[PDB]
Amino acid sequence: NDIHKLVLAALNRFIGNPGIQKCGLKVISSIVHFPDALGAMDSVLHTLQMYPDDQEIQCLGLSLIGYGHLLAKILVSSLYRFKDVAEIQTKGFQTILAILKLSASFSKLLVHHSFDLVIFHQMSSNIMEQKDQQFLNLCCKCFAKVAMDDYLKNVMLERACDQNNSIMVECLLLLGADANQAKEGSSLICQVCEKESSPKLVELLLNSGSREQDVRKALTISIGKGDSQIISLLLRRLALDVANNSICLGGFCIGKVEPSWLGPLFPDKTSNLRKQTNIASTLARMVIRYQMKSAVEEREYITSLDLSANELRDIDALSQKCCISVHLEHLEKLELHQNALTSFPQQLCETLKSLTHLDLHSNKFTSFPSYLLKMSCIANLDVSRNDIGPSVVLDPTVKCPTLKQFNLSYNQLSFVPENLTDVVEKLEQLILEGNKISGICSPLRLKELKILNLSKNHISSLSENFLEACPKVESFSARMNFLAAMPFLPPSMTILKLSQNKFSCIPEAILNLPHLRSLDMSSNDIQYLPGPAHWKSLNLRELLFSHNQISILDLSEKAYLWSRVEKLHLSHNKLKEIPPEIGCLENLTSLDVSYNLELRSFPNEMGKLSKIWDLPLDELHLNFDFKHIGCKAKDIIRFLQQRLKKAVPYNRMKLMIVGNTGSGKTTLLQQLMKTKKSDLGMQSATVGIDVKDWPIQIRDKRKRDLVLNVWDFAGREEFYSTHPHFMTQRALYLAVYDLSKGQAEVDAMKPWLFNIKARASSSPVILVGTHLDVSKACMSKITKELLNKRGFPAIRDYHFVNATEESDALAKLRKTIINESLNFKIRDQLVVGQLIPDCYVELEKIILSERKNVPIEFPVIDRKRLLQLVRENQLQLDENELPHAVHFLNESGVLLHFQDPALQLSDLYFVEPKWLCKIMAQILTVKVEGCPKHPKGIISRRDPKNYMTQYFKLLEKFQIALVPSSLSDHRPVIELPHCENSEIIIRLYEMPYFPMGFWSRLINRLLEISPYMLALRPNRMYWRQGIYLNWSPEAYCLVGSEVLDNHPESFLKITVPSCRKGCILLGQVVDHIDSLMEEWFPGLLEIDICGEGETLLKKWALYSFNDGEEHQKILLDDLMKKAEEGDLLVNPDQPRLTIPISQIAPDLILADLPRNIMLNNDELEFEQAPEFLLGDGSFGSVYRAAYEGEEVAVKIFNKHTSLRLLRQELVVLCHLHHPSLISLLAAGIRPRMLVMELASKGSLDRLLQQDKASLTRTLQHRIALHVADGLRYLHSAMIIYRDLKPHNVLLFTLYPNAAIIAKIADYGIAQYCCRMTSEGTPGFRAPEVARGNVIYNQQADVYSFGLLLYDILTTGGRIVEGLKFPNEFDELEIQGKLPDPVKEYGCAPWPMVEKLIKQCLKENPQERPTSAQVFDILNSAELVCLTRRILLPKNVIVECMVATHHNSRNASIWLGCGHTDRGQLSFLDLNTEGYTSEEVADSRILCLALVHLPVEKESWIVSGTQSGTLLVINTEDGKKRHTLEKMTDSVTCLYCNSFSKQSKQKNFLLVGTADGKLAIFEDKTVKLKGAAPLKILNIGNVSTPLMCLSESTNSTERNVMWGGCGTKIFSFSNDFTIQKLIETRTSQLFSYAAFSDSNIITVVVDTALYIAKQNSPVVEVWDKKTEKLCGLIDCVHFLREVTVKENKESKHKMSYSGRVKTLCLQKNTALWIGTGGGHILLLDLSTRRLIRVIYNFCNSVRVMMTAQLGSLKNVMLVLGYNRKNTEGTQKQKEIQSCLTVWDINLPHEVQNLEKHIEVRKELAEKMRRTSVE
């Protein structure tokens, strides 16, 4: 057995190459076994290539391969060269199967070469029906290991769609292999429609995962070609809402519509298709089996037809008699707006006889057809942007009465349509705005006009008989016309709007309308507003009269006659004062008297108008300072009411003495106050500010004892960083010389005066000489020569007192100070004696008394102490008065309190400010003469009981920390990386003198902004007056401070590299340098028109033509360059060369922002001028236009937004980028505009207020989900939206299964966070937001979301009910008492979101779910399907139920009883939900059934009980009851079949008793007492109880009936004989016995049989023909996979409860397992086993069945239990039978919705890539 034959034989078969191999292969094959020999592979591989094509050796070679990659290259090339020659593929696939199981990666090599080319042919060469089961098993075992790698699956699928092969592509889809992965721009469907594939190949790709964007691209592709079966399949997945009967073809750019496409979109009753793709499912099952083996041991015609944006240049293609010309006749909605049609085809407009919302606007019509009106039942005919000819006369041969809303907006009309009165009788909303109507109108004999309109026409006037024949007009509104009077308006008008006309007085035809409700006459030029005794109408609510010329506001005559008025707009008028009689209009809500410039006072009466929630105060001055951080137009009412209580004059002023390093300040203050003592013989230099107070009872006729508090500020320069905090605008400043250095010190005093002009422009100053004893008195020259009136504040006197002892000059100084104080008069208001409520004075008195009762070590007071001291006294202040009270007392120098939220010490109140000011200056004077270990100025924590904490918890909040004062005045030498005059940008800030606390606060605002260029911090070396922070030679910034020679001013040089990151630096630094100047120093950037516009702040820009070595930088004032905005480049008088403005000031042009949002004005196809393109927003500011070839909405800004604010909003708006957020596209200048995405379907509120019929209980869910996603993104980005209303939800499409539906407008947060409606709209407002007491939170956005959900659910019921009653529309919901959605409004109960509402409607803020949860609770797919739960009365046990489908109008679900051992039928309606009880049997009833008789029109209802007493009772009559034959054993199942075997309609009844005896009856024989059983079929035994029944899935088998009996299922037919006796206990796969060795419980008839037994946690799947257990599907095989982490106690529940308590099978989609536990299972019976388990809604799913209710057919009822162990210790449980009603369409949603999230999650990331780059 051992010789050297092996080597000789191998080598001789090698050399013997022409024709020897036939025997050599046989020899080596024979020898490969015996010694188990081990260099032949290469040669036996070589012989194949050296001599192919010989079958007899090919088979042998394949047989010997099984005993480098080129191997594979020969293998398939062999099997492909012999595709189907013989069973040599067997040997081949054996070879592959052998090779893969030892070399896994080689599989990837096989698919590398060609393996698909042969394996697909093998699996598709009709191997099925060729009984080669062993061979196919071999191929499947091979493939299972081939498709191990998922990437191999994806590439195999890619190459399997290249060659059209439906069966294998389906098999691969069932095996995973997602179909949206190829290229994302040319992914599967794109080429599959390019390569001219089959309809079945496209349908399978669409049905599974295929991204919608790719589907749209493929639709464009398949439009390119002419295909009629692939187009109709793309539309059927892109645009069809079967639940709503719609076609949402809106956004698509279909070039032309042809009926051969929409043919199959319309429903077709004939559509019925067989099951031939079962081959693919079987192969998938085999592959899955082999994979897990390799894994484990090793009517209703659709109505809405939307064709909006498809640029249909013609629609004639549907007018013909084509395939769909019979489905169109019941359309009832047709949208053709925004196309480019013309001449609607006459044949079409009579083809469809049921159309009622035909709207086709923005088309290019040129003649109103006048044959559109011959349709049968038409309404809302809408042609509203076409170019309708000059006249639109309606032909009088049409008598169409049904028209209701005949819109004709924005045409080119020249007349009212002529023959309305003879054609459109019942017309209601005749709208004719935007036309060019010129001549006087017709008498207009319309009998039913309800809302006319004539806006923007050119009307001369109205004929006196214009409205004399329209007795129901309600809303005549002729805006923007040239109108002079009104012609006897009918007495029925309610709302009348007449703005922008030319009146001179309200025509008396308006003053007498007996029901008028609102009257808007803005922009008129009227003179006299008649008093309320001229209006004759008890119901005036709105009186809009802005922009008129009104003198008086007459209310003295009779004010209560306007007691209901709720809106009164009087802005832009010549008003003088508000009469006190305004205090009677209690129902006032929104008063507006702004922009009057001549009002100057508010009467104390207005404090009684507590309903006011807004009150603009723009451009008018009052007797008090408003808008501190409060004064929200509501606290003002509290102030005006408390001042009504008791108004006293307030005498207290501020006299801020100011000096410089030494003067008569303290020795002049201690002489003004006449302080005799000055006990310190030599007082030393001042620390801090040293507030003192001194009363002055002026001993004169004016007994006003004024108390002005002196703050003798610090002289020495060291304290100069904090002073601008103690320089308010209400003061009387002094200043002092020390005239010893006369005419030289007076120069050095210049900065001080400048700062006084910087902080308080309108504050008086008094110079005071301080020296006559020390000698130069000609100083009055220079103060009159230089110092007086050139950029320095309003000097009003000057004196020369000695200031060491009393003097006549000192007395004159006293008199001057007193007379200057009492005559202050800012805005002509006389500050010194203004009126305040006495409550403030009382609080001031008690605080002053408290100042002697405070700990010296810590003079602070806690807010608790203050709220205790208000209780100690009898103060009339609430928690809403103090927020203004303490601020006002801060203004008077009593106590400093800081309301700044960032400064987290607002809880502290610093009574005795003379200690806070003294302590804040201790650090600035403590030095360290030890070791200068750190550079001069930087320091760490180096100093009592916890006071060290608060000291620097104030000081660095005070931005003293590193002390920016006494910090290296001399600048360290710095050199920029590039200084070549052309890579840098430079901007100046020339100002006459740096203000006091400028650099200290400037270097502290630039400093802490670390995330520049977005978190990489820069290196910075910052002296007193510079920073120079740099990241690289590519990004740096030097905010220097130099003085150029021969320039006594002081500049602020900024240098930033001209790179792209540089412009970001420059913009973000100029913002922080400009916002400061207008926040603290409003005097500087105050253009003084008196004199000239110096502005004291000449922000230059430096630009140079000569790139590098320009030898000089050319100045340009920033304002004048901003005037050069009409262009984009600058150029000198020499125009050949020029500089780009985007390079010398990239902040003015919006270039610092991410460059992708640059305007690109060239591609903007936009027309601001027209108002028909204003369509977005009623007379708003957001238009509609085209850009980049797509429709987008521009937002033209008015003159309000300063460009700096626009940039401040764009910076935050530009990096949100979420699929549920309105995203920017471009923004720019010329004009100052903004472009965003066009929300096609407009705001939500419109949709839910006039189009309720589209919200469909699954769009009302997608909208809420998308809005919750928006909030969850915002709240994660740490910004609260603060105002969310159905006015701010912008829809995109009404097709439910879309990727982007709802999108909240995010411009609100920009407009909010830029300029700080922050309190939110009244109705849509959280409880903490209306009261305004508490600082706000995310829990207010959550409450706003709750209200949004409530409005969506009721579909605009609350909004409509509140627009007539707003003052309750807010206050009823301000407490969470808004009513139950179901009782007040008709709505689908939807009771899983009602709990969401009542959780988001909790008053406690942090008790409301956070936004992430309220999105993750809507993400669940079992709230979009649950429809209503009915907790039955307390402790009722019910175990049986039957529905009613014969009366499908309103149905009642008849239940049984288990709580009584004796029988009782338990009726239960659904629309009333009223349970009733009626004992009818003497023994507990077990089941019921419905036998409806087509004759006599009744539905007898039958009931089988445990006693066998088979009861029958009539539907309506509960008295005509006759029990039939008393049965022998317990009846267990009743059933009503479909057995029409007698050539007529026929039915029977089955009585399943506990023994098997089939007591069958007939449909009609139920009436006679003791019915007659036709065929008494005793089937089972006494020990084998008949326990279940079922019926066939199809009707082609003549409804073969199947019933379970004992443990053996049986069946019969019209023969009524047992056709099979299948036995289940005799199973050959015992995992356990009693799961099959028990009585049957359920049976379902389908392609297979699914069966369960008592307490069987596994279901058995038999076949009808083979009678084999083809399936064994275990329940805990699914439950114990989700109950792994969420149930840790389940580890103790190994003896698990949980089993199949009932079956219920859907038609062909899935199967619903009802567990004996508290769970339910979805089973996709075709491919994948578990779809979802929906638990935690009951505890025991007892009964389940299918039914139909009220045209909402096919619902699934689930009678489960919820036991309460309230007294479980008493061995009793509290039972609630929680009957629920799921919508049977659940198994789709749960797999549809879980796709929908994924599609957005990807979009949630891809969008955030644009934020990166």
Ligand SMILES: Nc1ncnc2c1ncn2[C@@H]1O[C@H](COP(=O)(O)OP(=O)(O)OP(=O)(O)O)[C@@H](O)[C@H]1O
């Ligand atoms: N991108 C858009 N697409 C379609 N409609 C829009 C878009 N943006 C805004 N609108 C609509 O235009 C209307 C006016 O917008 P606007 O921002 O003026 O509303 P507003 O903020 O309530 O009014 P205001 O700014 O005067 O307070 C709104 O009804 C909004 O629905």
Ligand SMILES: Nc1nc2c(ncn2[C@@H]2O[C@H](COP(=O)(O)OP(=O)(O)O)[C@@H](O)[C@H]2O)c(=O)[nH]1
């Ligand atoms: N001899 C004399 N001394 C004066 C006169 N006016 C002010 N002084 C001196 O100025 C000092 C007051 O210091 P002061 O300016 O209040 O300190 P500062 O507030 O920190 O700048 C006193 O010590 C006086 O000696 C004056 O008219 N005559």
